[PDB]
Design a protein around this ligand. Structure first.
Ligand SMILES: C[C@H](NC(=O)c1ccc(CN)cc1)c1cccc2c(-c3ccc(CN4CCOCC4)nc3)c(C(=O)O)[nH]c12
Ligand SMILES: [Zn+2]
Ligand SMILES: [Zn+2]
Length: 232
């Protein structure tokens, strides 16, 4: 009923959208992994009379449900998608998207890692993002590679029209107490990567984590803090 939707409020298989700003929504879905249930966020950005999608809804059937929810609530076609790292909460559902006419994109790093892991593989490579601090335009967003954090390939997305920073899994929600799933992470570089984000997007008004509740710029410092303390 208007609050940001949380894990116990979304059955697995259903997707909710949340209006962030004019022409910007998050998408929220839930999935089982290793016997526990988790929420996950992505982004939708209006691109004229089309939509740009950031990240799948974590699975084939969740992603089909995402497309249906978008048609119900927004009614414009998703034409392109970007996956912000190689994990299943970002690429699982890419095959569904491709079969629905969506052109799927990711960095070459992400594509390699997805292929090696046996995850779904976006079709098109995003060049120009291989060095930390790199940025490229993609429709109504800027894609930014901050350096290794949650994963070596993680990208962040900025919506300049709305000052919305989508951190993906490199950014945690304020209630976080732990670095999350860190098997592919670089705990030593993660604070430095977050500091790059802080420096590059000082006007961000909304910060959206990969999982959990959006907030403001404090999510960035909080993330750095949690990661440093976890490593320690
Ligand atoms: C899809 C993704 N696969 C991986 O990561 C992965 C998988 C395999 C390998 C090595 N082959 C390496 C990495 C993933 C799965 C499950 C939970 C997560 C989480 C996550 C997010 C938040 C929390 C904190 N909650 C815990 C319970 O209650 C309160 C808060 N825990 C885990 C993330 C993420 O941190 O981005 N990704 C996940
Ligand atoms: Zn991940
Ligand atoms: Zn994640």
């Amino acid at each position: 009923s208007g609050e940001y939707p949380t894990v116990n409020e979304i059955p697995v298989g259903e997707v909710r959208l949340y209006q962030i700003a004019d022409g910007v929504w998050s998408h929220i879905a839930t999935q089982s992994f290793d016997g526990a249930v988790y929420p996950s966020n992505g982004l939708i950005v209006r691109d004229g009379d089309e939509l740009l999608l950031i990240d799948t809804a974590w699975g084939a059937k969740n992603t089909a449900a995402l497309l249906a929810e978008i048609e119900k609530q927004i009614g414009l076609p998703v034409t392109r998608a970007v996956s912000t790292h190689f994990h299943d909460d970002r690429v699982g559902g890419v095959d569904v998207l491709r079969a629905a006419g969506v052109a799927t994109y990711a960095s070459p790093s992400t594509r390699r890692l997805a292929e090696a892991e046996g995850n779904e593989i976006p079709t098109h490579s995003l060049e120009g993002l291989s060095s930390s601090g790199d940025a490229v335009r993609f429709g109504p967003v800027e894609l930014f590679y901050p350096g290794a954090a949650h994963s070596t390939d993680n990208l962040v997305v900025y919506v300049p029209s709305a000052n919305v920073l989508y951190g993906g899994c490199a950014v945690h929600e304020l209630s976080s107490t732990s670095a999350g799933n860190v098997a592919d992470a670089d705990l030593a570089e993660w604070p430095t990567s977050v500091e790059r984000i802080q420096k590059h997007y000082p006007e961000a008004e909304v910060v959206i984590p990969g999982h959990g509740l959006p907030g403001g710029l404090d999510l960035l410092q909080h993330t750095a803090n949690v990661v440093k303390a976890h490593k320690n």
